[PDB]
Design a protein around this nucleic acid. Structure first.
Lengths: 81, 717, 699, 232, 23, 62, 225
RNA sequence: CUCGA
């Protein structure tokens, strides 16, 4: 029920704040998942026990933070408070 | 979005550019990638785009008064060497474009990027944390363009005509597209009142009910409206399903619409709708005929006819002073009161002389910017000017800036102008210092609990009831009722509860109480929150920026400090009164208080003043000693008459202010208790800030007052 | 910056200094205007920063007496009769009489028309008084203002705030490549320019024997010759270009005191601080939103607001502990391609264009072996002078126009321990850019937000597109009606006018001098301050504006004309105020004010990045900005700002490494500045200790 | 002069009779130069047919209500004005529409004479009540753009005939916007965005082609003077 | 006429008052 | 004492601190800002600080 | 009410200015065509202009030549007014050698075959007894306004002085429309375009270049998808 | 020191 979110407003911040309790918690979720994704892209050619790769299909040259944020929007992650 | 120069981003993302260059084998090693970036080889500009993609950056403009002085943006590479800023955030940054500079910071860690993307993005910070009203809204040219196309012109071309004689109804269009074509040919004016069949705009909830009602209006359902093509163009910008508004878009109207959109609709919708409003407003401000010309600054027609009749009363006092009938110091007040009525009568002579085609009037009456007093000095008369002493000069500035000041008129204007600049510098200094004090006293005040669950609230005067039966809205509803949370169920005359306890008093939820006959509420306050260290969210209420219950962890103390310190820049009581209150000094007014409720003992003379109270119950007489230079406050006596000047025999309650002034908070504490002194501080400070046109929510002040009374002293170890 | 800046600077009156007072000892009373400053110090021209009121400019007719007080001239009034006798009075001398305002109606003989006249009286009291009471009267209306202030047309219609801004920004004008005198002047431009001394006036009358771009020789009447040398492309103190050009030609008769060659911001001997631009006062698609400015790329194409700037670069070759620094073209590990533009000495050659970072002077300094990194020593083994060449700083670029070399070997006396010194002069030709700051004479300032193509600009009826678009909203708030008037007269001066002389002189122009009833296009005029064009006369002149070459009158008697949107073609629905306004290029250009830093120097003691663009420093994240962060709750951003991005000695290095590696950002360490705090608190005999959760002091 | 290559036109279909067109990238600032021309050519220079005037039986000087029908005269005129029609005869053509008894009147209940063709037989016109009867005559002409009803004052005879605004243009609503696109290094090039909503008489592709052809001939009038230089 | 002393361009003034003393 | 010494009367606060032999429990915004620890507010509080994100068992074929 | 394909006729005002009348045009359409043609004319008309210069005794712009009254910067500004046309579409060199005393004008330039100066009377410099001026002028063909080609981007060495190139030969374009709004079936616009050039090309040639430009451009819409 | 928002 809105115009197509362009650039950095996607995923919509309004839907992101429903899978989470508060603005602040979302930050840690996204950042730590982004760190896991970066370790995946740096440990893809070497080693096992590599952190879980991009769950969703990554756009070409997409920032890890963006991929983790979309994962959050797609209810593909858990948490441990 | 924000636009930064290519060179700026190349230096900022230098290591990122080196990484990507050595990756795509544009450089042999990273060491050579660095030399490439430093020599600015053409490869980087195609690589840099990959690096900056969706990587947010922070923009800061000093002075950083409140948190919206720093916002996050998606960076866009631009040619040139200046930073491109969005026109709506100007208000937040208080940033004009006359040489202002901004700083850019690059968040590095994934966590920094997340914080900027979520917490600090400009689209997620539209509302003012101090008041809850929107900031990134149409403000200047935008509001002018919207006010333009949303105006109803009676005699405009293409107007709707009623069916009469040989022709039926002229000016009745089948589709807004048809009206557009008619305006293109030049038959219809955008601002003419017409009848249009709409098929993609929800009709007002007033008419939707009688036309549909049984089923909500559906996209595709048609209906006739009596608006202007311009108002239709306007209603297409705000989201589908928003009830059509057939109003003239003054600034207040637009702020109201955006406030309702922020309440009801989600964030992103407001973010995009306000951008659409910006585009429309600029397009039409360009084509609104708004221009300044010497001719459009109309001087009053009877201007000389108006001015000699205060040069009179200036001359009157000269011989009531020549024969000695007026003192030299009373003459000044007389002549001041003479010319001050001049300026008002001239304002009245100006409002009617100014036509509505005048562009200055279209600038001011549309709420764009400026008062009518500025237009009085511009087109009427500058009036009485003050010297560096303080009192108004017995001689006015008769000339207007359109007529041409005299030599001496300019010279005497400069006194005030220069001291204005000087004391404004000093005022900003004192304001900033008060600000840092407030910050440090409340820095460690965070929202640590969800609900302390504590009866203690406070009674908010929702509205007053007139003797005839009508309810008068209290002026403090905005700052004392909104964003609160209930402390007592709302009860009308019937047993029905209007609002349940714990519900955020929003706009419609206030209208509920008001239409129910209930005039008092008990609301949860941070004053009352009984938490060991922090404060509970329930007592705090709605986060003014988020529009929802404050999240656990938000540093509300700094937010309160900043919200109070940002407006300090504009003051005159005065700002020293705010300091007197926050430092718990022995005030200037030093007004006494009734230590025991009882009967008043007015024993007034002329040598001195002595007042005693006979306790209404037991007790002994309490004696005071005051100078006859003070005056008794008209206390709302038991007679129900607010104008009851305190005379003997009145029944005053304990802790009642006796004579006018400013009561000593220290005695208020040891008389009425911590609750009452906190309430006193809050609304005594709020008087200063409201008597200057500044709307701070009581929440923020309470946050500070809470810290003032956290400690107690030791009588016996 | 420009001749007027220098003149004003020489006519400054400072309150600060030894024997005067400290800035911390200056109340709101020392700074505000005093009634005795009339005709002596200007109440307008004064900084608006922390030095407001402490620094005035001397009034125009003011002089100093041998005792030190500032005298001003007054005309003696004998018996209600104005005399040409002029006497100079001090402040206390003036207070012992009563003087009349300059603009009092006077008879052609000298008697006052009205019995009552405005009069200033002791203690700064203004009131009317009988004509038989006037002792003296003012010399000129502009007696109270400064040189700069008197250069504001229609000053009597501007508010003191915008007027102060205008008089202060005239001193920030940048000398343009070519200078145009303003259409609308005030009379002060001539004497301002001449007295400023940056022009060339003939000392004695004669004729011009031989004139060159280099010098001008004057053959006097008696037989002597004097040659004035022009100062060509000289670097001003503030990087503006001082360049004098001859005005007269060969074999021209010239009188004594005439300007034979004018310098920067001058045209035929008048102060030309800016250009006459065709202005349209309308909003335009938000690009001029509150005080931003829109310009026609014509001003870029025809170098209308182009200005020259000259930077001085300097390097020396000293004696070091391990030898002596030598300036040499032979630099270690430098390609022959970067050294291509250098002469045999390692000095850049004249005429070479240089970007930021290029080599200008090749200096290598010998470094000792005990100062090498283990990785540096290995890289030296796996493969003694280091590079200290003079490179071009970031953001600089231009043609190398001059070199100066001083060698202790070649007699040149240098400071002890210096063997060679080279100064390189680089000149840049800065066109007007997005973000450069323009301003008028009424404190109407702004930056360039968009430079549109000449076809996009809203153009007049005859196709001539405007040059600059000023937003309307930022006009009636500021109370600078001057520009409005200035604009209208502007147009009148560009087109000219012809008043209807037939059937007598119209009733509005009765007070105009006969020289003003007819004017050719591009005519020069003066609006003397507190005198000059009255609104009525301006209305009339707008009524009698000349038609264009096609016989059409483009502007209405209101002063507005009909414009066409160059982007869509449709004409704009309403008439717009069109005119000519004098706009100055202020010395606040993005080419100078842009800056950015990834990494760079760090202060030794605090280990925090340096400050200033010139040292390649970073921006300061102050206390208030930290409150902003804490407000948002961006904890990690705050930490990252105050640790890895600043003075975390090991954290910043690991961040750089992690960026070039693509790894994640590491965990911030401790700020070295806090270690410094601890050591200082110890230096004050305070035993500070950091305890762990167990209670043991940790080091 | 030389070349300025790779300007491409792409279409995005929103509905069966609505499309967006992107022209990209154009030399600065050609997007603005041609965008307004194309919009005006679409809304004003596409041949179409539409109703010029009508005449309802029983309405001579009241033009207020028709007995037996729920809609008044103006609402009848409004729903008839949206009727889409095409004509192959250049001269005015007369249609009739008659229906008696309760029920609903549609555009399919119209009888088109030879040469004309109705493209929306399902459009609602009126709801007929019990014993309700509606008889109306419709004058159809060929034109372009939108010509108001007042100039059609002569098409209504002084005998019940009512002129109506004529929507001759087959396109209904056109808008456009221009963004900046950087092809190689400079970010000056313009990207033109057309938004065209038309009637089911023609598709957006053919409508845009017609506007392009008319404009090509128009500027060919200037090209036929000398024939010098400009790229491809 | 304005500033008729050195040999400067004839800038015409709207001056109503006469200058008894030059700057 | 660190939060107070950084506000006003630096000397007058440090003398009192050294006399009373005060310990600063490094648990305050100003203080953690001074020493560079995460502020106990917003994203720094313990509720949000220590959190492990794990993907739901749903995974793609590769 | 139907079509009748319009006509374009030319009226000559001066040797470098013409008015063009286009009629009949759809109502409202006149202003758009005036503006479309104006925007193409003012920005995209092929012309020739000086790319670079080279004076013997000079190395950069910020100097003086002995014996000439104007410095190098003023000479370059005086040269910016040079109107020239070229047939080569490749770089071509003009020469100027002149000894003082006298005045150097644009007619003292010797243009190679293919280029031509249209205002030989333009003042360039004033030479005294000791004045000597030797100058090379590199002229290229282009359209619009291209800033001076850098020497770091070009292969030109130090002696070459680049200059801004104002290729556009058109000077001033305006338009007016006469509308026929007689409340009847026939409304129509008549467009009057006004084109003034700088003797480099005639107004008709400029309008023809604009016409070819726009025909080629609008041909993109005719091709389907 | 002088200056810009």
């Amino acid at each position: 029920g809105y115009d197509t979110p362009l650039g950095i407003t996607n995923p919509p911040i309004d839907e992101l704040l429903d899978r989470v309790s508060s603005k602040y918690a979302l930050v840690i979720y996204a950042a730590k998942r982004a760190r896991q994704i970066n370790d995946y892209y740096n440990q893809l050619g070497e080693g096992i026990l590599e952190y879980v790769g991009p769950l969703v299909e990554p756009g070409l040259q997409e920032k890890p933070l963006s991929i983790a944020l979309r994962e959050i929007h797609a209810d593909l992650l858990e948490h441990t408070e | 979005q924000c636009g930064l120069p290519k060179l700026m981003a190349l230096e900022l993302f230098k290591p990122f550019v080196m990484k990507r260059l050595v990756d795509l084998n544009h450089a042999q090693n990273i060491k050579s990638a660095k030399r490439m970036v430093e020599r600015q080889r053409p490869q980087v500009w195609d690589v840099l785009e990959e690096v900056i993609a969706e990587h947010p950056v922070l923009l800061n403009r000093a002075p950083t008064l409140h948190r919206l002085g720093i916002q996050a943006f998606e960076p866009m590479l631009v040619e040139g060497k200046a930073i491109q800023l969005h026109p709506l955030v100007c208000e937040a940054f208080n940033a004009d474009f006359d040489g202002d500079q901004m700083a850019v910071h690059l968040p590095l860690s994934a966590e920094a990027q997340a914080e900027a993307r979520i917490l600090m993005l400009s689209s997620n910070n539209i509302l003012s944390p101090a008041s809850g009203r929107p900031l990134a809204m149409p403000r200047l040219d935008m509001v002018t363009g919207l006010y333009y196309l949303t105006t109803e012109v009676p005699g405009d071309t293409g107007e709707y005509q009623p069916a009469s004689g040989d022709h039926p109804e002229t000016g009745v269009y089948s589709s807004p597209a048809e009206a557009i074509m008619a305006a293109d040919r030049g038959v219809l004016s955008v601002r003419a009142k017409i009848k249009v069949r709409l098929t993609q705009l929800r009709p007002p909830v007033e008419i939707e009910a009688e036309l549909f009602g049984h089923s909500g209006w559906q996209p595709g359902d048609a209906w006739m409206a009596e608006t202007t093509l311009g108002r239709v163009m306007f209603n297409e910008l705000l989201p589908l399903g928003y009830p059509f508004v057939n109003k003239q878009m003054h600034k207040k109207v637009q702020a109201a619409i955006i406030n309702d959109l922020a309440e009801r609709y989600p964030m992103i919708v407001v973010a995009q709708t306000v951008d659409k409003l910006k585009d429309a407003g600029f397009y039409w401000a360009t084509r609104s005929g708004v221009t300044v010309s010497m001719a459009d600054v109309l001087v009053p027609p009877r201007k000389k006819e108006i001015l000699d009749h205060y040069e009179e009363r200036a001359d009157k006092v000269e011989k009531q002073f020549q024969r000695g009938a007026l003192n030299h110091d009373e003459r000044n007040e007389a002549l001041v009161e003479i010319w001050k009525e001049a300026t008002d009568e001239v304002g009245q002579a100006l409002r009617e002389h100014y036509p509505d085609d005048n562009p200055i009037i279209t600038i001011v009456d549309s709420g764009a910017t400026g008062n009518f007093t500025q237009t009085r000095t511009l087109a009427g008369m500058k009036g009485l000017v003050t010297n560096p002493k303080g009192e108004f000069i017995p001689r006015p500035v008769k000339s207007s800036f359109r007529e041409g000041l005299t030599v001496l008129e300019y010279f005497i204007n400069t006194h005030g102008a220069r001291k204005g600049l000087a004391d404004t510098a000093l005022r900003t200094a004192d304001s900033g210092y008060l600000t840092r004090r407030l910050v440090d006293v409340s820095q460690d005040v965070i929202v640590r609990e969800h609900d302390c669950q504590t009866e203690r609230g406070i009674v908010v005067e929702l509205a007053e009831r007139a003797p005839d039966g009508t309810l008068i809205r209290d002026p403090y509803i905005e700052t004392s009722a909104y964003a609160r949370t209930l402390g007592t169920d709302a009860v009308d005359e019937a047993g029905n509860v209007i609002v349940e306890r714990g519900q955020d008093l929003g706009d419609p939820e206030i209208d509920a109480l008001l239409a129910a006959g209930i005039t008092q509420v008990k609301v949860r306050s941070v004053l009352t929150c009984a938490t060991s260290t922090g404060v509970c969210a329930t007592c705090y209420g709605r986060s003014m920026a988020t529009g929802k219950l404050v999240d656990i962890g938000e540093a509300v103390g700094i937010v309160a400090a900043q919200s109070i310190g940002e407006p300090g820049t504009q003051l005159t009581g005065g700002l020293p009164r705010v300091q007197e209150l926050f430092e718990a000094r022995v005030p200037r007014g030093k007004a006494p208080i009734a230590d025991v409720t009882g009967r008043v003992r007015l024993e007034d003379g002329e040598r001195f003043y002595k007042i005693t109270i006979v306790p209404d119950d037991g007790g002994e007489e309490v004696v005071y000693d005051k100078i006859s230079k003070r005056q008794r406050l008209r206390v709302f006596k038991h007679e129900d008459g607010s104008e009851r000047v305190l005379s003997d025999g009145d029944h005053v309650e304990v802790g009642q202010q006796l004579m006018e002034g400013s009561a000593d908070p220290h005695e208020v504490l040891r008389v009425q208790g911590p609750r009452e002194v906190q309430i006193h501080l809050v609304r005594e400070v709020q008087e200063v800030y409201r008597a200057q046109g500044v709307s701070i929510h009581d929440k923020h002040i309470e946050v500070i007052v809470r810290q003032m009374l956290r400690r107690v002293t030791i009588i016996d170890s | 910056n420009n001749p007027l800046s220098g003149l004003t600077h020489k006519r400054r009156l400072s309150a600060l200094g030894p024997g005067g007072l400290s800035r911390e000892r200056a109340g709101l009373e020392v700074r505000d205007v005093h009634p005795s400053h009339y005709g002596r110090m200007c109440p307008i021209e004064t900084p608006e920063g922390p030095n407001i009121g402490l620094i005035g400019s001397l009034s125009v007719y003011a002089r100093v007496n041998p005792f030190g007080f500032i005298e001003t001239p007054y005309r003696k009034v004998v018996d209600g009769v104005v005399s040409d006798e002029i006497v100079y009075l001090t402040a206390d001398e003036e207070d012992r009489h009563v003087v009349a305002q300059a603009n009092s109606p006077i008879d052609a003989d000298g008697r006052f028309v009205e019995p009552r006249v405005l009069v200033r009286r002791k203690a700064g009291e203004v009131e009317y008084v009988p004509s038989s009471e006037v002792d003296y009267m003012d010399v000129s209306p502009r007696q109270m203002v400064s040189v700069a202030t008197a250069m504001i047309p229609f000053l009597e219609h501007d508010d003191a705030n915008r007027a102060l801004m205008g008089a202060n920004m005239q001193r920030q004008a940048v000398p343009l490549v070519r200078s145009e005198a303003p259409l609308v002047g005030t009379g002060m431009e001539l004497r301002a320019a001449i007295d400023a001394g940056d022009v060339v006036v003939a000392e004695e009358s004669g004729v011009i024997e031989e004139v060159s771009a280099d010098y001008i020789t004057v053959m006097h009447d008696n037989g002597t010759r004097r040659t004035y040398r022009m100062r060509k492309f000289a670097r001003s103190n503030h990087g503006t270009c001082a360049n004098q050009c001859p005005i007269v030609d060969a074999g021209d008769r010239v009188e004594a005191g005439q300007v034979i060659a004018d310098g920067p911001c001058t045209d035929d001997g008048e102060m030309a601080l800016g250009k006459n631009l065709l202005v349209a006062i309308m909003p335009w698609e938000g690009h001029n939103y509150e005080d931003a400015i829109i310009l026609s790329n014509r001003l870029v194409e025809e170098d209308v607001l182009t200005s020259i700037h000259i930077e001085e670069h300097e390097i020396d070759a000293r004696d070091t502990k391990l030898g002596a620094e030598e300036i040499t073209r032979d630099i270690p590990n430098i390609s022959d391609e970067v050294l291509a533009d250098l002469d045999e000495r390692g000095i850049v050659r004249i005429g070479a264009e240089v970007r930021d970072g290029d080599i200008l002077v090749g200096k290598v300094t010998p470094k000792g072996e005990t100062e090498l990194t283990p990785e540096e020593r290995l890289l030296r083994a796996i493969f003694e002078v280091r590079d200290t060449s003079l490179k071009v700083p970031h953001g600089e670029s231009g043609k190398v126009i001059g070199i100066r070399v001083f060698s202790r070997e070649d007699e040149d006396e240098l400071p002890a321990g210096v063997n060679e010194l080279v100064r390189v002069y680089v000149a840049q030709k800065r066109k007007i850019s997005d973000g450069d700051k323009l301003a008028g004479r009424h404190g109407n300032k702004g930056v360039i937000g968009k430079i549109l193509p000449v076809e996009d600009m809203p153009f007049l009826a005859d196709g001539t597109p405007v040059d600059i678009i000023l937003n309307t909203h930022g006009v009636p708030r500021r109370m600078n009606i001057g520009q409005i008037l200035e604009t209208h007269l502007g147009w009148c001066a560009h087109s000219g006018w012809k008043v209807d002389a037939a059937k007598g002189v119209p009733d509005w122009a009765a007070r105009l001098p006969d020289e003003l009833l007819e004017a050719q296009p591009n005519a020069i005029v003066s609006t003397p301050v507190f005198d000059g064009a009255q609104e009525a006369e301006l209305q009339g002149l707008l009524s009698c504006t000349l038609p264009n070459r096609d016989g059409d009158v483009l502007v209405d008697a209101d002063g507005k004309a009909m414009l066409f949107d160059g982007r869509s073609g449709e004409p704009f629905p309403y008439p717009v105020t069109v005119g000519y306004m004098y706009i100055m290029k202020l010395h606040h250009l993005v080419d100078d004010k842009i800056h950015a830093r990834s990494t760079g120097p760090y202060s030794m003691i605090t280990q925090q990045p340096l400050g200033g663009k010139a040292q390649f420093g970073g921006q300061r994240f102050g206390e208030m900005e930290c409150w902003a962060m804490q407000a948002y709750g961006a904890a990690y951003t705050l930490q990252e700002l105050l640790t890895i991005k600043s003075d975390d000695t090991v954290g910043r290095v690991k961040v750089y490494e992690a960026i070039v590696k693509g790894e994640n950002i590491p965990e911030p360490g401790i700020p070295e500045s806090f270690k410094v705090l601890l050591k200082e608190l110890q230096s004050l005999c305070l035993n500070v200790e950091v305890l762990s959760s167990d209670g043991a002091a940790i080091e | 002069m030389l070349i300025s290559q790779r300007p491409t036109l792409s279409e995005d279909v929103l509905t069966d009779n609505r499309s967006q067109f992107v022209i990209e990238p154009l030399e600065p600032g050609f997007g603005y130069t041609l965008g307004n021309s194309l919009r005006r050519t679409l809304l004003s220079s596409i041949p179409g047919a539409a109703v010029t005037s009508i005449r309802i039986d029983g309405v001579l000087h009241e033009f207020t209500t028709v007995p037996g029908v729920k809609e008044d005269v103006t609402e009848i005129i409004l729903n008839l004005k949206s009727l889409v029609v095409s004509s192959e005869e250049d001269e005015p053509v007369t249609m009739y529409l008659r229906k008696q008894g309760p029920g609903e009147v549609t555009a399919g209940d119209i009888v088109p004479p030879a040469g004309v063709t109705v493209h929306n037989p399902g459009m609602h016109i009126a709801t007929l009540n019990d014993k309700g009867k509606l008889e109306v005559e419709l004058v159809v002409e060929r034109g372009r753009g939108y010509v108001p009803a007042v100039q059609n004052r002569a098409s209504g005879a002084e005998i019940g005939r009512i002129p109506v605004d004529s929507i001759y243009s087959p396109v209904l609503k056109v808008t456009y916007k221009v963004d900046a696109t950087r092809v190689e290094q400079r970010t000056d090039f313009d990207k033109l965005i057309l938004d065209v909503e038309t009637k089911n008489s023609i598709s957006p592709r053919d409508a845009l082609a017609s506007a392009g052809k008319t404009l090509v001939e128009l500027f060919g009038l200037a090209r036929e003077l000398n024939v010098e230089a400009e790229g491809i | 006429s304005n500033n008729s002393v050195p040999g400067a361009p004839n800038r015409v003034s709207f001056a109503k008052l006469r200058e008894p003393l030059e700057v | 004492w660190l939060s107070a010494a950084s506000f006003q009367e630096t000397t007058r606060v440090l003398t009192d601190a050294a006399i009373n032999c005060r310990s600063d429990k490094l648990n305050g915004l100003k203080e953690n800002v001074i020493i560079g620890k995460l502020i106990p507010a917003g994203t720094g509080i313990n509720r949000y600080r220590n959190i492990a994100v794990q993907p739901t068992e749903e995974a793609r074929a590769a």
